[PDB]
Amino acid sequence: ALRPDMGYNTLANFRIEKKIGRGQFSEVYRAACLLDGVPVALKKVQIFDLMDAKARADCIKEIDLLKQLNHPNVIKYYASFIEDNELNIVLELADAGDLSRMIKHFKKQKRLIPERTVWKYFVQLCSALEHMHSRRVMHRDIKPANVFITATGVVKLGDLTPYYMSPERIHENGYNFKSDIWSLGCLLYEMAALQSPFYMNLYSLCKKIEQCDYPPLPSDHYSEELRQLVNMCINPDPEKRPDVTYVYDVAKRMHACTA
Numbered sequence: 001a002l003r004p005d006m007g008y009n010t011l012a013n014f015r016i017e018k019k020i021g022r023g024q025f026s027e028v029y030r031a032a033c034l035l036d037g038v039p040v041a042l043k044k045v046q047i048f049d050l051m052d053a054k055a056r057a058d059c060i061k062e063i064d065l066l067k068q069l070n071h072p073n074v075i076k077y078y079a080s081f082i083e084d085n086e087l088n089i090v091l092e093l094a095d096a097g098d099l100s101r102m103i104k105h106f107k108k109q110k111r112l113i114p115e116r117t118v119w120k121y122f123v124q125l126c127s128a129l130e131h132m133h134s135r136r137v138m139h140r141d142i143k144p145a146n147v148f149i150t151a152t153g154v155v156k157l158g159d160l161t162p163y164y165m166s167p168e169r170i171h172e173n174g175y176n177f178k179s180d181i182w183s184l185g186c187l188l189y190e191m192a193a194l195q196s197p198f199y200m201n202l203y204s205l206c207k208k209i210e211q212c213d214y215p216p217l218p219s220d221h222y223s224e225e226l227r228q229l230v231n232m233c234i235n236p237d238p239e240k241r242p243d244v245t246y247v248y249d250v251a252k253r254m255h256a257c258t259a
C-alpha cells in the first residue's frame with residue numbers, strides 16, 4: 001500500500017515492471033515511482049548474506065555520499081534503504097545502451113569513430129567526472145559498459161576483474177583520483193582505437209604499462225591534441241597525470257572547435 005510521505009524510500013511506492021539485469025551481487029529491475037510516474041532502475045542486494053558489519057558501513061556510507069551527487073551526466077541515486085532484509089538502491093534508469101555497444105557498432109561497420117564524435121561524447125564524460133571530483137567522490141569503475149548513453153546521445157556515467165587496471169590498483173595501492181584519470185585516458189584511447197590500449201595477465205600488463213607498450217593512434221585520423229591527452233592520462237606515474245579539470249578544459253576546447 002502506497003506511502004506518500006516515504007518518497008522514493010519504500011518499495012510500496014514502486015511498481016516493478018521487469019527484471020532487466022542480473023548482477024554478481026544484485027538483481028536489477030525496471031520500475032516506476034507510483035507517486036510521480038518517473039521510471040527507475042531498482043537494485044536489490046542480499047547484503048546480509050554477503051556482507052559483514054564493516055562492509056555494510058563502508059558500502060552504505062559510500063552510497064550516502066553518492067546520493068548527494070547531482071549532474072546531468074551522472075546516473076542519479078534517488079534513494080537507498082534497507083527493506084525485506086535487502087539493500088534497495090533506486091537509480092536513474094539508463095535503458096538505451098552504452099559506450100561499449102557504440103564501439104561494437106563501429107567495429108561492425110568497420111569504421112573508426114570520427115574525432116569530432118569522440119569529443120562530443122568524451123566532453124560529457126569529463127563533465128560528469130569533474131562534478132564527482134569537485135564533490136570529492138571517486139568513481140572507481142570507469143569503463144565503456146559503465147558509460148550509458150540515452151537514446152538522445154546524452155552520456156550518463158553509470159553507477160559505481162576490473163576492465164581498466166591502473167598500475168597503483170594492480171599493485172594494491174589505494175585507488176584515488178588520479179586512478180580515475182587513468183581509466184578516463186584508456187577510455188579515450190578505446191574510443192579512437194576500438195580496443196583497450198593494453199588489450200594477458202597482470203604481470204604482462206604491468207610490463208606493458210611501465211613501457212607504454214600500446215599501439216599509437218593514427219595521426220591522420222586523430223589530432224595531436226587527442227593523442228597527447230591520451231598520453232598524459234595513462235602515464236604510469238599518478239603525479240604525472242593531470243587533474244580532471246585540465247582534461248575537461250581540453251575536451252571543451254576540442255569539442256568547440258571540431259563542431
Ligand SMILES: Nc1ncnc2c1ncn2[C@@H]1O[C@H](COP(=O)(O)OP(=O)(O)O)[C@@H](O)[C@H]1O
Nearest residue numbers: 021022023024025026028041091092093094095
Ligand atoms: N541505472 C541502471 N539502469 C539500467 N540498467 C542498469 C542500471 N544499473 C545497472 N544496470 C544493469 O544491471 C546489470 C547488472 O548490474 P551491475 O551493475 O553488474 O550490479 P552488480 O555489479 O552489483 O552485480 C547490468 O547489465 C547493467 O546493464
Ligand SMILES: [Mg+2]
Nearest residue numbers: 022023024025
Ligand atoms: Mg556484475
Ligand code: NI
Nearest residue numbers: 171203206207
Ligand atoms: Ni608490477
